[PDB]
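Key idea: predict the complex, not the pieces.
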Amino acid sequence: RATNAQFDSPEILRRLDVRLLEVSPGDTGWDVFSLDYHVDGPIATVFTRECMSHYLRVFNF
Amino acid sequence: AAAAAANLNAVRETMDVLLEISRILNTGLDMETLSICVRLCEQGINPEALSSVIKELRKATEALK
Amino acid sequence: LVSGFEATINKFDKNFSAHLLDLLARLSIYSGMASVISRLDFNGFYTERLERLSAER
Amino acid sequence: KSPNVLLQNLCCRILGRSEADVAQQFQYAVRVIGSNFAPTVERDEFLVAEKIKKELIRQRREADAALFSELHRKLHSQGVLKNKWSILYLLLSLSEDPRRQPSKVSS
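Result:
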């Protein structure tokens, strides 16, 4: 709501969610924090599971 | 004889593979302490308790050094 | 005056607060929905009293 | 051997001492291990395997998460291990993140 991202369609704003990774031993949250954007429907035929894992590798860098 | 020698090879193989799993997980164990922990987990013992015991003995080793 | 009354006051206030803890904590394991805790626990009040049972085993 | 004499060997492996020297820590270890001997959760190796695969997948080490799948099958191939859940539950708990330098041995 603070940025201009709230001025969008409420669908795509709802679909983005914080993904927690699996919890590491002694570390900080800056090494384990990533967005997931989750997709459910006929759009998943284009955005398959292979796409979101490679997007998460991009967000990793 | 022979079946008493094949078992020693089959234990040495597993005790190498468990050391590889231990080094990729970066556990602080070495080859000799791992043979104690594998022996302990053979008879049936809580890993939640034995891991707490190791996590405390390695925690109290530093206050003495 | 207080021997019969304040004795009933403190034992009820401790029994109220303990069941008020158990209502919040058993609703906190439910992850709209978790907001009934944070409404009851508004701006700093009773939102951090007990962490968890300090036990093991 | 018995588990009571076997805990003292562990206390001499971690702490480099003799059994006549270290006896305060062994008194603590009998306190923790004793009264906590029986298994408290149901045993399966499947959930601990999918947690170690998770453990290696997001340390950016997606290669070792598929090597663990080949190392976990060999434990079943040989068959000298009765409780495979316990050792994997233990080896997962003592795991540390290097954050880096996954200097790969093998061979």
